């Protein structure tokens, strides 16, 4: 029964993640259920904290209500006690605990998604985690989930060294996604986020030098196309 | 040439085709497509290595180009627009009826025959230069690194070796070279892939036949046994282990009735010199192979002896020289092997040691079997079972039956032994009987085989058996266990010992044994007793002066161990030996061992002390006597020595379980001749046969005594109580006899127990008005046994006397042990139904019915009726039936009496309780007559005016109407209509319990 | 090499050869199987022998002909092997131990081989019987029980002599038996024995040589069995079904009972069988499931197979002049039905559907006996069915599905009895309309009925224009009267109708075929949109293709303009992912029968495919899924594949318009999931020119190949069902014209692909609408190699 949910994960659009020396990167494709639909109204790559993002493979809805339940747990169980935001390791723990309970609870099915959660905490540095429907979670240098899972996972072993700059890992995760792509391949059908330098540009305010802004940045429709030309 | 013929258009191999423009046109086009697929493969592996979707579509274009030649095999079976032959066959074919088919079917059947004539054409061929180029490509792909590519390519290269000749050769001579590379190019996932290839059904199979290349390969899979980094080495071990389990070679002259090839012998004169030529090449092809393995054998022992320490895949070697320095069909027993296999005891590792034994014991039982076969390797597979020490015996010999009996009791001057399970005899004599000779020899072998066994005994030091058994004990603490593999190893040390090669003297195994006997350590005792069983399997080994040092050690040891002070841990072990040993060796190879358990200083008789002890014997003597069952059983003693009077249960029960076994040993009917026998079976009362197993008079006497000794003592409890009962001798006897019956009715002794039921066993048991509460105390269930004896192997003539015992005119004797005999009947009936003569089927029914009426016990009038239905169910004939219905409904029918009276009668009159109980059973005996018999309504109506009366009968007439209305429930939508009688209403009261109002 | 040839031989049995050579071949494989000393593929050799000695190689029996042709085999070799499985003293040497698969599995083979070569042990070595028993017997003891018994049953020959017969040894079997209680480890051998021996005596008594040295074995009341011997086996079988459940494959356990019946002295036996049915009665009841419900079912079937088995072997012999009073009479068939009818009716309602299909399958076996009773069964089955279609069982699921299985396993027989047959038009047009779209199961069990009625009935208007006709007025009124009669307790023997009126009813009943197919096609298009899947999608296509072949040109030419009509104007391919199969294939099967229909059907699929492409279909890229705006284009393309494949020579007309359309379909339209489809067009057209196949499957040929119009039950029982003028199959054979267009294409598409691909070797690594195009041309190339596969020669490279 957990086994059947991992199966809904095995199909459903491919997504991936790559840790580097100075950043993390996660991406998936935006398969348009129609051309009539405006694909900018749905986000497969969601912000959890300004230091932490997430992507999935599988059941759309189960991801949404998991991204919501997940943002909240970041406050209710960490920020409202210690004044900081949670560290990747622990926010991940609190999500696994959330899914692991849909498993061992009666009257409910587990979630139809595997999650890739990427982020940076001051003490543990960068890290990238996978969370399964089983509630188990593992730390990755890089991996992929979904259909293209096997092709891409093999390409990542081939191309990954522990000396990658974040720009190198963006480059990789675009190629990796180019071979699996189901629909068209541009900035309107690729979602890519990074966990890099602090972006003060994006704080919304200026006056306390101790807080410096989001590490999580979601690349614009433009930034993507720009990289795909010099590709 | 051609025998398949499928309308190939271009003429069936006439080379009516070669002179056809349309046919060079066609293949000149498949050539281009072939050379174009290579053009595209090189263009992709060069420009697009990192793509899976492309390479899959190409790999299917090759699965096609290589296969869809004569036929169409991919797409072969997609539902298309033809009706399916297999479907239609199911619809139309009746069985035992030749082709009852409609025209439609005949037509597919025929089309189905054409289509199979096409697929018949063997497409197997010689590689076409270009075809070799594409098969090399398909390998670089099954050697690729992407699972999304290498997995279809492998499946695609298998459909391609089905199609090419000795293509396996092409594949290996590419694998190995490019695996040897991927190892000196480091941790490659190309190694992980090459190993995945070697596990393909078709390859892994052809591997155990590649004698040339498996040399080099095992040494590559070894280098591979280092997870320098991956799932490798786990796969290399599964693979090297899979390998040890294949291979071998057959020298042995097909023990063929030369009539297996003669009938097909062509006239051709000596144009069958060819045959004696093949015989010779398929004989040095073989002898080369056989040498390649010996070369591999010695080239490994090199990497095991010389490689200071490789770790624990030290195991492949040993797991293999073993299925080799003991194969035969050749295999020159190497002495350097027996050295190396033993010097691996120095790694003090549980798994290695368990194997060095398992190996040393086979590597000898092979050399041993060369002497016994006189190097006539053929002689194994010839059922003229050679061994110089086996001897056949004629059993028809007027006199034989009493050689056996009086030779099985002979322990001192023994003439023959049957190690194993003694078949001949038992039923009858007449066959020839394979047997073994006394003081069995060792026999001679050539020098090569001699120096090999020397190199073991010179290695079996006082110290080496110390190290090795120690280990086997510690790996053994976890489990318990016995494994004969252990014992059949000690007999070996014994052969080696006093045959010359070891010189350890037996007095060394007597310490090694007395040594491992810590009354505390279980796995340590198990090693001691594993040792004993070896000294008794070591009489297939000379010295009558050692067979006396051993008979002497054993009576001394069984003393220390079994003569008082015995835990449920020892008993657990020794009792294991008793069930086993007598089955792997005739116990007369020892004067002391058996003549020790039968020395019965153990069975006291009364209780104003502590009586004494235990089945500190009984259950072990028994488990030996159980495993012989035939042989040795002279026990004039035991019978005269049994107890019955014993106060304790653990013994009363055991004395019983032993007698049971003592009887099964004198019950074998072993007759003189097969002819003398079948003449006894033919002249039997039952058109059937002889009671198989029949207890011999001198015993039918003993038993009869024990029952009539207990009838003598009925004065012993002239009036005592349950507390002063368990203490009387009458009880003690009775309890033992019971435990005995319980154990006869179980298993293969039933046919022995029957004669006694009618006069002895059933009059007993119903020793129950001999006190109900006395049974609850010493927990005995008689009721459950007496009735559980309703089912069982009864014979035509025994039925007679049993039905006559029940249905007794002395019946009236018993009291609520009546509802007991009545339940024994209900069971007999179910297991002797269809076998009871309509005479007996009546003596029963007239008893059952005489109980619906017995004044006093209301309890039974009801258990009788419940049973009367079991009868009337198989009673469909309508005049036995309709004549009962009448007999019963005469005691009630109509308003014979006016209301006030029915009330009075319903409470007291027995003749009417019966009449309503009976007529009630009849109706409850037809539960589901799918359309309802009109005698039922009309006779429930006669029953309803009575279920309206509260009393005792009017009660068991409400039972009958509710019981009924209930089982008719689902068929009731309909049964309603056969009740015109507004005596539908008449059936509404009926069920009343306290919760209704 | 041995194993290879031993196979090419297997391949040779498909044609014929001299019994004098079988004498030879058999002898080779008897002694070959028994080799020792090397790796041997025994299963193969014991199977050669068993096929060389086959006792029913198309009604011919090769064991008889080999006995008569002087075959004799050594028994000492066989028994000597089967005896290595005895306790050899000195454990160190015993090689075979039962219990451990690898060994028991050889033993089970030798034993099987022996059973095969039992009849070739010298009938003339008088002391071969006695010698062999006097040996096995002395070997019998508790520890051998397991290996001895089976041997006897398969290595000792059934001999019968003047002094020592084999039934001489019975009193000893009923000594072991009758001493242990029911124990399958034992019984199974006793029944196997006294039964394959009772079968023997019976076989031998009839026709052939009533002897073998002794007709001194008398039959009587209970086969070759004593009064008490029979009595015992009855109460033991009852023991098995009521108490101890100790039996395996029952075919074997039933023999003795069947082959102890004596047509002229039954009575005393049927008396014993009846009381055994009355005992067993309750345990079959649908709500008394237990350890027994298997044994009772697997038996009541095994027994009625093994009875009908015998009957159809005797009726084959009273086609050889020899009645024999031992034979089974019309009155045994009667009392057999009397016995097992309530029993069979109860079982078929059982809660387990497998345990039911046993009791239900017994109706077919009983009806083949054409007993006087036949009506009793047709009576039940038809009420149970008409009740079910009148929803009188709606509260109970099982009765509905059950009484549709009862009726299916019996359709073929109803088409015969000149009374029931009337109902069959009604019952069909009722099943068709009651095809549910929610109940997958009810539908699978209805198609069962619908396809069975079609498989044994010609969909034909049989009216000579007789004016009274009409389904009502003439059929319905009678059908209702028969049913009213049957329902009120009365049976069909009491049912009197004019041979005039009942033949009006039957002929007028063949009118409704038209108004009913309009309702089947409707129900198909409704099913295109259901998550029924696979097994049942196929079975439905069988029913649509069988229905077609059982159709006269009058009706078929209607059915065609009704698929054609509904295929175009339909509102039925919405839901996600459709079963196109259910509608495209039934078209192809129209073109099989009438190539003329292709010229225009294809040109309409193309000016409708060009239409869908031109308006954006397959414009939007996706692996993994077929876009729902495409679903229409995909229909027309599957149809074009399925319908070219069956076009054949009629494709010569519009040859050039196709090729040039195929090139258009590949110039436009790129999309990995559509290319696996479009690339099949090339195959379904190369295969259709040069593949040599059938073409005609009609129940009855031409429309006119008159056996007359008493032609219902499809000749399935008539001996003319297979004289050559009926079976006048059509067949497509590839002509010099077709092979020639065949080849034109091969080179024209072969070039088209290789060019367009040698072009794209000016590499855009990006595009990805590039790897889509190369995949496309390599699929078109691939499917160009297949189908077109029949023109290639494996051997070409030798030459």
Short mmCIF file of C-alpha atoms in Angstrom, two decimals, chain B residues 500-707:
data_model
loop_
_atom_site.label_atom_id
_atom_site.label_comp_id
_atom_site.label_asym_id
_atom_site.label_seq_id
_atom_site.Cartn_x
_atom_site.Cartn_y
_atom_site.Cartn_z
CA UNK B 500 46.56 -47.98 8.75
CA UNK B 501 46.53 -44.30 7.74
CA UNK B 502 45.88 -42.38 10.95
CA UNK B 503 47.28 -44.30 13.91
CA UNK B 504 45.41 -42.49 16.64
CA UNK B 505 44.22 -45.59 18.44
CA UNK B 506 40.53 -45.71 19.38
CA UNK B 507 41.36 -44.86 23.00
CA UNK B 508 41.75 -41.34 21.60
CA UNK B 509 38.10 -41.02 20.54
CA UNK B 510 37.01 -42.32 23.95
CA UNK B 511 38.55 -39.25 25.58
CA UNK B 512 37.48 -36.92 22.81
CA UNK B 513 34.02 -38.21 23.67
CA UNK B 514 34.08 -38.43 27.49
CA UNK B 515 35.60 -34.94 27.05
CA UNK B 516 32.62 -33.21 25.44
CA UNK B 517 30.22 -34.53 28.06
CA UNK B 518 29.56 -31.51 30.31
CA UNK B 519 26.19 -32.23 31.90
CA UNK B 520 25.73 -28.49 31.33
CA UNK B 521 26.62 -27.52 27.72
CA UNK B 522 23.95 -28.82 25.27
CA UNK B 523 25.73 -28.25 21.97
CA UNK B 524 28.74 -29.84 23.66
CA UNK B 525 26.85 -32.98 24.65
CA UNK B 526 25.44 -33.17 21.14
CA UNK B 527 29.02 -33.45 19.92
CA UNK B 528 29.75 -36.21 22.39
CA UNK B 529 26.75 -38.26 21.25
CA UNK B 530 27.49 -37.48 17.61
CA UNK B 531 30.80 -39.20 18.45
CA UNK B 532 29.16 -42.29 19.92
CA UNK B 533 26.96 -42.86 16.87
CA UNK B 534 30.17 -42.88 14.83
CA UNK B 535 31.80 -45.62 16.90
CA UNK B 536 28.76 -47.76 16.14
CA UNK B 537 28.93 -46.94 12.43
CA UNK B 538 32.58 -47.92 12.64
CA UNK B 539 32.14 -51.65 12.57
CA UNK B 540 32.34 -51.35 8.82
CA UNK B 541 35.97 -51.35 9.91
CA UNK B 542 38.08 -54.27 11.13
CA UNK B 543 39.67 -55.22 14.48
CA UNK B 544 37.63 -57.59 16.62
CA UNK B 545 39.97 -56.43 19.38
CA UNK B 546 38.90 -52.83 18.84
CA UNK B 547 35.25 -53.79 18.46
CA UNK B 548 35.72 -55.10 22.02
CA UNK B 549 37.54 -52.02 23.33
CA UNK B 550 34.52 -50.15 22.00
CA UNK B 551 31.80 -52.46 23.28
CA UNK B 552 33.57 -52.06 26.61
CA UNK B 553 33.80 -48.28 26.51
CA UNK B 554 30.14 -48.04 25.66
CA UNK B 555 28.66 -50.02 28.52
CA UNK B 556 30.87 -47.95 30.81
CA UNK B 557 29.77 -44.66 29.29
CA UNK B 558 26.03 -45.30 29.07
CA UNK B 559 26.43 -46.05 32.77
CA UNK B 560 27.89 -42.65 33.72
CA UNK B 561 25.35 -40.92 31.50
CA UNK B 562 22.00 -42.73 31.68
CA UNK B 563 22.23 -44.58 35.00
CA UNK B 564 20.70 -41.81 37.11
CA UNK B 565 21.21 -38.07 36.92
CA UNK B 566 19.42 -37.24 33.66
CA UNK B 567 18.11 -33.83 32.53
CA UNK B 568 15.45 -33.00 29.93
CA UNK B 569 18.46 -31.82 27.94
CA UNK B 570 20.22 -35.18 27.76
CA UNK B 571 16.96 -37.08 27.32
CA UNK B 572 16.37 -34.64 24.44
CA UNK B 573 19.63 -35.84 22.80
CA UNK B 574 19.92 -39.54 23.56
CA UNK B 575 16.27 -40.05 22.67
CA UNK B 576 17.22 -38.48 19.34
CA UNK B 577 19.87 -41.20 18.90
CA UNK B 578 17.55 -44.13 19.64
CA UNK B 579 15.16 -43.09 16.81
CA UNK B 580 18.04 -42.68 14.39
CA UNK B 581 20.93 -45.04 15.01
CA UNK B 582 19.05 -48.36 14.54
CA UNK B 583 18.09 -47.08 11.09
CA UNK B 584 21.63 -46.32 9.89
CA UNK B 585 23.21 -49.51 11.30
CA UNK B 586 22.14 -52.99 12.37
CA UNK B 587 22.58 -52.78 16.15
CA UNK B 588 23.91 -56.32 16.43
CA UNK B 589 27.28 -54.92 15.40
CA UNK B 590 27.51 -54.32 19.17
CA UNK B 591 27.02 -56.67 22.10
CA UNK B 592 26.80 -53.99 24.83
CA UNK B 593 24.91 -51.03 23.36
CA UNK B 594 21.51 -52.61 22.80
CA UNK B 595 21.91 -55.18 25.61
CA UNK B 596 22.02 -52.08 27.85
CA UNK B 597 18.73 -50.27 27.27
CA UNK B 598 16.91 -53.54 27.62
CA UNK B 599 18.51 -53.97 31.03
CA UNK B 600 15.42 -52.71 32.84
CA UNK B 601 16.23 -51.86 36.44
CA UNK B 602 13.41 -49.36 36.05
CA UNK B 603 9.76 -49.90 36.89
CA UNK B 604 8.66 -49.80 40.59
CA UNK B 605 5.15 -50.97 41.66
CA UNK B 606 3.52 -49.15 44.63
CA UNK B 607 3.43 -45.79 46.47
CA UNK B 608 4.16 -45.27 50.15
CA UNK B 609 7.71 -44.05 49.34
CA UNK B 610 8.56 -41.93 46.29
CA UNK B 611 7.96 -44.99 44.07
CA UNK B 612 11.20 -43.87 42.45
CA UNK B 613 12.02 -41.97 39.23
CA UNK B 614 11.31 -42.01 35.51
CA UNK B 615 10.95 -43.07 31.98
CA UNK B 616 14.68 -42.92 32.56
CA UNK B 617 14.47 -45.61 29.92
CA UNK B 618 11.01 -46.59 28.83
CA UNK B 619 10.64 -43.91 26.13
CA UNK B 620 14.21 -44.60 24.86
CA UNK B 621 14.08 -48.37 24.87
CA UNK B 622 10.82 -47.91 23.01
CA UNK B 623 12.24 -45.57 20.36
CA UNK B 624 14.87 -48.19 19.55
CA UNK B 625 12.39 -51.06 19.47
CA UNK B 626 10.31 -48.78 17.22
CA UNK B 627 13.13 -48.28 14.76
CA UNK B 628 13.85 -52.01 14.51
CA UNK B 629 10.26 -53.28 14.51
CA UNK B 630 11.11 -56.71 13.41
CA UNK B 631 14.75 -57.28 14.14
CA UNK B 632 16.20 -58.02 17.64
CA UNK B 633 12.78 -58.05 19.26
CA UNK B 634 13.22 -61.11 21.47
CA UNK B 635 11.68 -59.76 24.61
CA UNK B 636 10.52 -62.74 26.62
CA UNK B 637 11.57 -60.51 29.51
CA UNK B 638 9.70 -57.24 28.92
CA UNK B 639 6.23 -58.75 28.73
CA UNK B 640 6.73 -60.68 31.99
CA UNK B 641 8.22 -57.45 33.43
CA UNK B 642 5.62 -54.76 32.58
CA UNK B 643 3.85 -52.92 35.40
CA UNK B 644 0.38 -51.31 35.02
CA UNK B 645 0.22 -50.91 38.80
CA UNK B 646 2.45 -47.81 38.74
CA UNK B 647 1.27 -44.79 40.79
CA UNK B 648 2.76 -42.06 38.60
CA UNK B 649 1.29 -40.94 35.31
CA UNK B 650 4.50 -40.13 33.41
CA UNK B 651 5.17 -43.81 33.82
CA UNK B 652 1.68 -45.33 33.61
CA UNK B 653 1.37 -43.55 30.26
CA UNK B 654 4.81 -44.62 29.13
CA UNK B 655 4.37 -48.27 30.08
CA UNK B 656 1.31 -48.04 27.83
CA UNK B 657 3.05 -46.35 24.88
CA UNK B 658 5.71 -49.12 25.09
CA UNK B 659 3.36 -52.10 25.10
CA UNK B 660 1.73 -50.53 22.08
CA UNK B 661 5.12 -50.71 20.38
CA UNK B 662 5.93 -54.18 21.76
CA UNK B 663 2.78 -55.46 20.09
CA UNK B 664 3.45 -53.92 16.66
CA UNK B 665 6.68 -55.96 16.62
CA UNK B 666 5.06 -59.39 16.99
CA UNK B 667 2.18 -58.48 14.66
CA UNK B 668 4.11 -58.53 11.36
CA UNK B 669 2.72 -61.58 9.57
CA UNK B 670 5.90 -62.47 7.67
CA UNK B 671 4.84 -65.71 5.87
CA UNK B 672 6.77 -68.53 4.23
CA UNK B 673 5.94 -68.11 0.55
CA UNK B 674 4.19 -65.56 -1.64
CA UNK B 675 2.15 -68.55 -2.74
CA UNK B 676 1.49 -69.80 0.78
CA UNK B 677 0.41 -66.20 1.46
CA UNK B 678 -1.96 -65.40 -1.39
CA UNK B 679 -3.77 -68.67 -0.63
CA UNK B 680 -4.54 -67.32 2.82
CA UNK B 681 -5.80 -63.99 1.42
CA UNK B 682 -7.94 -65.77 -1.17
CA UNK B 683 -9.69 -67.97 1.43
CA UNK B 684 -10.89 -65.16 3.73
CA UNK B 685 -14.51 -64.59 4.90
CA UNK B 686 -14.66 -61.06 3.53
CA UNK B 687 -14.27 -61.10 -0.29
CA UNK B 688 -11.52 -58.74 0.90
CA UNK B 689 -8.36 -60.08 2.48
CA UNK B 690 -6.47 -61.08 5.59
CA UNK B 691 -6.21 -58.80 8.52
CA UNK B 692 -2.89 -57.17 7.67
CA UNK B 693 -0.94 -57.23 10.94
CA UNK B 694 -2.59 -59.76 13.21
CA UNK B 695 -1.69 -60.01 16.88
CA UNK B 696 -0.28 -63.54 17.58
CA UNK B 697 -2.25 -65.72 20.05
CA UNK B 698 0.41 -65.77 22.83
CA UNK B 699 -0.25 -62.00 22.96
CA UNK B 700 -4.03 -62.05 22.48
CA UNK B 701 -3.69 -63.99 25.73
CA UNK B 702 -1.68 -61.35 27.61
CA UNK B 703 -4.09 -58.56 26.74
CA UNK B 704 -7.21 -60.53 27.53
CA UNK B 705 -5.60 -61.13 30.93
CA UNK B 706 -5.04 -57.45 31.73
CA UNK B 707 -8.74 -56.73 31.11
#
